[PDB]
Amino acid sequence: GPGMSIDDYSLVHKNILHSEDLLKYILETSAYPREHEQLKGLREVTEKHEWSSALVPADEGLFLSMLLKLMNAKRTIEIGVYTGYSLLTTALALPEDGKITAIDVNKSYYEIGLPFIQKAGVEHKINFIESEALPVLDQMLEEMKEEDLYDYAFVDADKSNYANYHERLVKLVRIGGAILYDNTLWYGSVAYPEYPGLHPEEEVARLSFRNLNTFLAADPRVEISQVSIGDGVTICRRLY
Amino acid sequence: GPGSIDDYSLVHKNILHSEDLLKYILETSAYPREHEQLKGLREVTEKHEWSSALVPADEGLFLSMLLKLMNAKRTIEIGVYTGYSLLTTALALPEDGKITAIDVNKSYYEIGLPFIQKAGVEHKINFIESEALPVLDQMLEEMKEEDLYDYAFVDADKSNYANYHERLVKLVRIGGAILYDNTLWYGSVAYPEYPGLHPEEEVARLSFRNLNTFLAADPRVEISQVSIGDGVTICRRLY
Ligand SMILES: Nc1ncnc2c1ncn2[C@@H]1O[C@H](CSCC[C@H](N)C(=O)O)[C@@H](O)[C@H]1O
Ligand SMILES: Nc1ncnc2c1ncn2[C@@H]1O[C@H](CSCC[C@H](N)C(=O)O)[C@@H](O)[C@H]1O
Numbered sequence: 040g041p042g043m044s045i046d047d048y049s050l051v052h053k054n055i056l057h058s059e060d061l062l063k064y065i066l067e068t069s070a071y072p073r074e075h076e077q078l079k080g081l082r083e084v085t086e087k088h089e090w091s092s093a094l095v096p097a098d099e100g101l102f103l104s105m106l107l108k109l110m111n112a113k114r115t116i117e118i119g120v121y122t123g124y125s126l127l128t129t130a131l132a133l134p135e136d137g138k139i140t141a142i143d144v145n146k147s148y149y150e151i152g153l154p155f156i157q158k159a160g161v162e163h164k165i166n167f168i169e170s171e172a173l174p175v176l177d178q179m180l181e182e183m184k185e186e187d188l189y190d191y192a193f194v195d196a197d198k199s200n201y202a203n204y205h206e207r208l209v210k211l212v213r214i215g216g217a218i219l220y221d222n223t224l225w226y227g228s229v230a231y232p233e234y235p236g237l238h239p240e241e242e243v244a245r246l247s248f249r250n251l252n253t254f255l256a257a258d259p260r261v262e263i264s265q266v267s268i269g270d271g272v273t274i275c276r277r278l279y
Numbered sequence: 280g281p282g283s284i285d286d287y288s289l290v291h292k293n294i295l296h297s298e299d300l301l302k303y304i305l306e307t308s309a310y311p312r313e314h315e316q317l318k319g320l321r322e323v324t325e326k327h328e329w330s331s332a333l334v335p336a337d338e339g340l341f342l343s344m345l346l347k348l349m350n351a352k353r354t355i356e357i358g359v360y361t362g363y364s365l366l367t368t369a370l371a372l373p374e375d376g377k378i379t380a381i382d383v384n385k386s387y388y389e390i391g392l393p394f395i396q397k398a399g400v401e402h403k404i405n406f407i408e409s410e411a412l413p414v415l416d417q418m419l420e421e422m423k424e425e426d427l428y429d430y431a432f433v434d435a436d437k438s439n440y441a442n443y444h445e446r447l448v449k450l451v452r453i454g455g456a457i458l459y460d461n462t463l464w465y466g467s468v469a470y471p472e473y474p475g476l477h478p479e480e481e482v483a484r485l486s487f488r489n490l491n492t493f494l495a496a497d498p499r500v501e502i503s504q505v506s507i508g509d510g511v512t513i514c515r516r517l518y
């Protein structure tokens with residue numbers, strides 16, 4: 040209730056890889072040398088923030104950048120911005136005329152990263168909307184034409200609500216476009232029907248992801264690839 | 280020379296934190312999406328002496344997804360074994376897609392060939408039985424700019440990836456992808472020394488540490504090292 044925290048949360052310090060040494064090797068060898076100076080800055084100030092556990096990591100970021108470039112994405116939607124690491128990643132990867140619709144309930148987080156976005160010279164690509172994501176997506180469904188469908192969506196907002204996001208995004212991303220769901224392995228806790236001692240919010244997210252992973256594997260509208268990078272990323276490609 | 284598969288130390292090591300997590304991914308997200316003929320090919324390969332070299336099913340779906348997202352049409356596969364990643368590629372490509380597939384050992388390919396045929400995609404594949412570098416070098420002297428590959432999957436002799444790279448950054452189009460398989464070498468690349476390895480395993484481990492450093496510094500490409508399977512490094516040609 041009234042009072043003032045993130046180790047009432049149980050999964051903060053876990054990782055899906057076998058050792059922290061392997062993760063550090065990947066980051067130091069392959070990610071940090073390829074990370075834009077302004078992503079480095081954004082990440083380092085986020086690492087001191089209360090919710091740094093939620094930050095998209097740098098090896099995952101370079102993978103998002105790679106996918107965006109390989110598929111020649113130009114119009115994207117970013118749901119769950121936090122301090123803007125995945126958003127700046129996207130903005131740097133897109134061509135100069137790329138356009139991003141960015142949605143987050145808490146703009147104060149975004150203002151932490153916004154100076155780095157500005158210095159990188161890519162703020163002009165970003166339309167930031169401070170809102171719960173689902174009302175925005177529902178309004179887009181009434182607004183958008185087939186000419187305006189998105190090439191790519193990155194989904195990283197309310198971890199209990201991805202299935203509802205998916206029902207909108209399979210209509211807002213073009214045929215052949217990509218929807219990426221972040222955190223679909225939820226620190227490994229999805230591997231069991233029951234799991235001990237999580238925060239109620241973490242447990243709701245865990246069950247949501249177990250149900251989402253099963254549903255997406257069964258969903259004829261997409262083909263999928265669940266990738267054990269970061270905390271699990273499920274790539275979906277719209278078939279019809 | 281004077282001095283086998285069951286001599287390797289690392290074969291059963293996971294890069295994920297538990298076998299249960301890996302099995303979850305495979306049972307939930309990979310096997311339900313694996314083509315019947317890929318399942319059949321995997322099952323016979325699991326029984327083979329060199330099953331440890333098999334590309335796993337979750338990695339397969341990731342390769343397939345990359346191929347479709349980038350609209351690849353012409354590809355090269357280096358290191359075929361029984362054909363799992365080759366069949367993945369051939370199913371992913373359009374009906375008129377084409378693959379150049381190179382392996383020193385066609386007998387391995389013939390294990391998977393019946394499944395490739397039943398999948399109806401053998402016509403996309405030009406299988407060359409040879410060491411890869413002589414083929415790649417002959418391609419360099421014949422390749423026309425308009426025939427450059429969209430995508431290359433590199434999974435052959437581990438100690439030789441750096442030599443393959445020097446050819447492939449010229450054989451794949453600008454904006455095209457070169458994927459190197461096994462770049463985390465079961466996690467053993469994470470340390471300067473790693474006891475208990477077969478001599479060939481240690482050669483590969485050192486080759487990958489050098490390669491990973493080299494690729495991260497190579498201005499001809501952008502890269503992303505992905506902790507899927509045994510590590511896959513995606514390269515994108517810049518010039
Ligand atoms: N219903 C909702 N709609 C939109 N954003 C939400 C939301 N519920 C939570 N969020 C936001 O989702 C974010 C999750 S963390 C996002 C991390 C970010 N992608 C990165 O690159 O690091 C938080 O910023 C939180 O404010
Ligand atoms: N110098 C060389 N040139 C071409 N192929 C080679 C080679 N050295 C080893 N190989 C081949 O590389 C393969 C490595 S295993 C490849 C696994 C396969 N990509 C899969 O999807 O499962 C073996 O079939 C081996 O015969």
Ligand SMILES: [Mg+2]
Pocket residue numbers: 093094095195221222
């Ligand atoms: Mg996330």
Ligand SMILES: [Mg+2]
Pocket residue numbers: 332333334434460461
């Ligand atoms: Mg391999």
